[PDB]
Design a protein around this ligand. Structure first.
Ligand SMILES: [Mg+2]
Ligand SMILES: [Mg+2]
Ligand SMILES: [Mg+2]
Ligand SMILES: [Mg+2]
Lengths: 393, 393, 393, 393
């Protein structure tokens, strides 16, 4: 419960560097120098750091300034050994992206935004990032009439497929991860959840290198079960990255420490990333990225406390989830409840639809009332998970 | 604002026949005979009626009883001319489906449930239904540990692909529509929204004849924009059916009359079904199905009032949405706001990613501050839509 | 973690007795005989039992049937030693109550509902109940014009003042507890949250013996912090009873076991009930009542299992919350965050507004930016708390 | 639909002046000079203007700067005739207020916050404001152990009683209006809803001149019915001010124009404000204040457009709500649904509880099932209302 680099905890530069400006107030902390960020995270046990183009390099920066910033940064990474596993672009802060990057009603802003992305892919390759995240935060509307809904999706597809074709063309070993979000900053964002995101990728021409980057808080903002949406992404072989934080209900994006929102949910999230599926199946072996914000009420000691907290929470949940699954009481409760039974195909090997229709024991002579008497024992099984969680077993 | 059969208003037998039992009380109305339902709906201007297998035919019914019920029903349809455009199966009422049909932890219940579906497909063909709806209402969990998340999806796929292969095999001209729902009756349902549903179909073997059946209320239960989710379904060419009702917020499934929930949203929903996309694209020309419930406080006069209300609301919204789009002030407001501009591809014909990166006017020499000065005028445009809605223009 | 009568765990007859019918399906369990409920609950460690008049005595019961049923139930209580601390009135399942009891639009119904309550006060008094709970579940509307909102609150007051007047008159030592609920079964219910119930009580003629019965899931259905709510009820000394359960978000009411919802909020509710306020103040001493429903997926072993899960959940939280406040590291963290500092009055002993305004050091020469440097360290206090919750420290 | 000063449309300086910075981006508009705001608003038909102390006078303003600024603003008011009906205090943007003003854990900060309020009361009185608004935006927490909840309410009371005491002492005719808000910017805010604010007021020493300022979007953020909320405030005669805007669901605060959110609820709020209660009762006569923000996508033409949209929205709703209640068909529908019947007291003139209980016809021989046959016809009353809303009848 001391993190180490094979744990693969990655942190975004914008998280610990978030100085505290919210919509009702100014920053409460001084800016965090990025070299200092790299040194402080390496020391806490982080494996890597991620950033947005404008997190390191100002929008305004001249070529010389860009060279100077990147040199110090590269030096810092070298001194520490921190990797840079994911890179992303800021397509939401400057006033020009008031109506989006890629789905901006203005065509000249869509070309600028797509060029901001291609340049960033080149920097992403250079850094040795394996994933390029795309968070379309300003793509949407506040009013139903603001957009042509089909055009938005065509413009979004265009953007994404041009970027993907460009990776392919240059031979970069980079994958694109789209990060779905319900709302905020727009009152409605395009591809609001994990399924919209997932569905969207199947319409792309270069879909093969496009996957997702779900975020705890984002699904929770539409009241979805985070464990069930990552399950589906994994199931489809599209869980390319993951962002973990906490959220307490449907409200503004809180960005708390992982485990400080919905704890029981955090627990089962960690059981799926760590243990996978009960009957076997896919596993996610990428980085465990923390995309959160150190509460504005706290000074810099709280920033480093908060960074430590993320990794601690994940490790506490991991031991509890490993003991839980190892527990023989839990394994037999799982058996009773039919967890392993769900793993069995419904049809017998070689059985056809006509075969089952016509099988008298599966329908005509099936006793539905007897079958309804089964005690699934889901509460008891729920109860065992929580007793494991509470460290009482 | 007198409905007629080319309007294609279809009503489910369970809507007007809903006698009023909620989780806190008993029915407040007497049962509605299904022949009387057909006669009363034909007379109100409905085009068709839909039903769940157990809405017409009791679970218990002997073959003779099934023959007798279907004969009277068929007679009624013949006497009136009402079609039966969609059929669906009850996989959620009997105690046997306490943990689902298709994703039931018990394998014997999954075989029964799939056989209940194949038999129903045969009845669906017989009735001349073009769509077979599948609402997986009991597929999910209340506890994160109740299921093996990957197995659930494999079991769901198995069910759905067996049913689809069986349509194909028998040569029925029937399509399957899955209806996504966030929650209720389960605390979390599998394929909770339109994207999960959409994503899910791309993993199926018989995906080609599988599409969606979104419902106003269902998306609204996860706080999504209904117009933007049907837009995406349409965009993907998967909007096979549609269910319209009203819902006032994130809470239990209310099932109000279309236009009695979120009115402005209802309005833009009707603008998309009726007018389509501003720059052109797909159109939805299937039935406009009302899946709602006549409030339990009201007697039978309210049931028929409520049925009339659905069609009235849709026709009032339709005229307001046609005037709105015809309005030359509105067309020029759309132009200013860049609604048509979104229709233009981002890249020039023949332009490549390298071409745009390297185009100095799109990036390097792009004036982002000048571009940020643009007045999108989205509020004014929103305001014009509402003045059209209020019948003030 | 073995409950004893000393713990004051009370259960509603309706909870273990809930047979499984929900809006989409029939009962999955057989009716529970009340004598068995009493016997079962006494073997688990329950302190008492509570009921609604129609949980015990059927709506259409003859006089002979009523006495048999009470002879049976009084015998059971006598045999087992269980107490009956609370009694409530079912003003919701019979179709007569579709528009409410007390705020029904029909005056004849308001008279019957209130008659039904007065008779029930006699019964409650006879049983030795100390609390009389009023849950106005059908009090509200689906539509904004259905009700005259000032007249609904006048009617509500009349009902509550008549019942309280009657208690005072008859010399019964009963206190009325109003149970606020935002929705379900009505689309909007009168006196939606703790706040609303408390405000209403202050408009009552006999508000001195009228307080609240907050329920965990009801407040979570509005997105409110359950703990902030009962704190406010406590502070006004109006916390007369409490109903504990689980709710996983804004959706239908789940009625999960306590701690099977929002764990961390459950942990903080236990802390408040057990440890009181950090700086002292009123404490809650009534029954810890569980109003939940055994999931319908579970048979009768599941029912006694979930009844036991309420009590184990609570005892495990209590143990952690006691360990939490006793930790010296936590006591120190609390001092550091200003938790005890909030207890010191803002003004000085006999300081006036005018004295405060001209004091130079409090305003005029107050260094606002120096003050703003304080690291409140709330993340670290939060992290310690979860660490005590997880049985880690 | 041309507003006139007689309409009492008031606007906050912060609303038209909002420059566009949100959590994900910088300002998209230039600062608005306050003199121009005053002039612009008087040309649109505004009756008055309201501000926060720091909207006008910068936090670090010298004495010389403060007088210049007030000379400029007083001149503008004089020139245009605008009134200043409400003044409020910014106890939220400066980093000193990260934990609150009045309920900050730091005692030195509580003293400065209250000093800052007292000084602002003098200013408000000087300006001729009738209402003093208190919005405790930083009063709350992200974490359940950050605060002693009884001590936070004691501190809050001290602050409000000190300010009210001061008003009384100085002979100013100002009334305090507390503005409840459930969240944002804190994860949970003290006095979350109308209900909570009203309950708190009754625990105050000087609660007689302390009332509420409900805001439309704040209540919709909890899923509450805005109309039920102000009705309850009205009924207790505590509706001192109102803030009108739009909110599309439980998500961040949108601050859309009034009627650009939930239309039908907007329609029913106008009806209540204009027509009062169907059976009579208190009526609201203060300013109709708009606290919204011009979407950041819109330039300055958009700003004056949205200021005008507030007033047109309201005037269009008012016209429909007046037409609605005057319709004979609607008056009849209301009688039929029992709307006036709710106004008749339940008991008879000098009827006691005891008299009611033994009356055979009210209980004992009351035919509950005959009573339950009444068709309340709420769907048809709702349908008439939407038809008047849509300018259809
Ligand atoms: Mg993220
Ligand atoms: Mg449906
Ligand atoms: Mg309760
Ligand atoms: Mg406000």
């Amino acid at each position: 419960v001391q993190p180490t680099p094979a744990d693969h905890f990655t942190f975004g530069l914008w998280t610990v560097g978030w100085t505290g400006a919210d919509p009702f107030g100014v920053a409460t902390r001084k800016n965090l120098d990025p070299v200092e960020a790299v040194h402080k995270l390496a020391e806490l046990g982080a494996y890597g750091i991620t950033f947005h183009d404008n997190d390191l390099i100002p929008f305004d920066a001249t070529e010389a300034e860009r060279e100077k910033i990147l040199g110090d940064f590269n030096q810092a990474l070298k001194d520490t050994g921190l990797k840079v596993p994911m890179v992303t672009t800021n397509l939401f802060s400057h006033p020009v992206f008031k109506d989006g990057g890629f789905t901006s009603n203005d065509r000249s802003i869509r070309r600028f935004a797509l060029a901001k992305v291609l340049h960033n892919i080149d920097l992403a390759a250079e850094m040795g990032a394996e994933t390029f995240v795309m968070w379309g935060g300003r793509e949407g509307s506040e009013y139903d009439g603001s957009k042509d809904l089909a055009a938005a999706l065509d413009r979004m597809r265009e953007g994404v497929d041009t970027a993907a074709g460009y990776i392919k063309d240059k031979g970069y070993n980079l994958r694109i991860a789209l990060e779905p979000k319900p709302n905020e900053p727009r009152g409605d964002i395009f591809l609001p959840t994990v399924g919209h995101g997932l569905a969207f990728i199947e319409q792309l021409e270069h879909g093969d290198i496009v996957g997702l980057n779900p975020e705890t808080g984002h699904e929770q903002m539409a009241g979805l079960n985070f464990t069930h949406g990552i399950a589906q992404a994994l199931w489809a072989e599209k869980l390319f990255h993951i962002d973990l934080n906490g959220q307490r209900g449907i409200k503004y994006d809180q960005d708390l420490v992982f485990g400080h929102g919905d704890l029981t949910s955090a627990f089962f999230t960690v059981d799926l990333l760590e243990n996978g599926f009960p009957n076997g199946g896919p596993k996610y072996t990428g980085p465990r990225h923390f995309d959160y914000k150190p509460s504005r009420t706290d000074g810099y000691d709280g920033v480093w406390d908060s960074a430590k907290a993320n990794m601690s929470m994940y490790l506490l949940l991991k031991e509890r989830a490993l003991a839980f699954r190892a527990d023989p009481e839990v394994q037999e409760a799982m058996k009773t409840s039919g967890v392993f039974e769900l793993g069995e195909t419904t049809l017998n090997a070689g059985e056809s639809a006509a075969d089952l229709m016509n099988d008298s024991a599966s329908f005509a002579g099936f006793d539905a009332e007897a079958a309804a008497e089964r005690n699934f024992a889901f509460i008891r099984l729920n109860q065992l998970a929580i007793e494991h969680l509470l460290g009482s077993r």
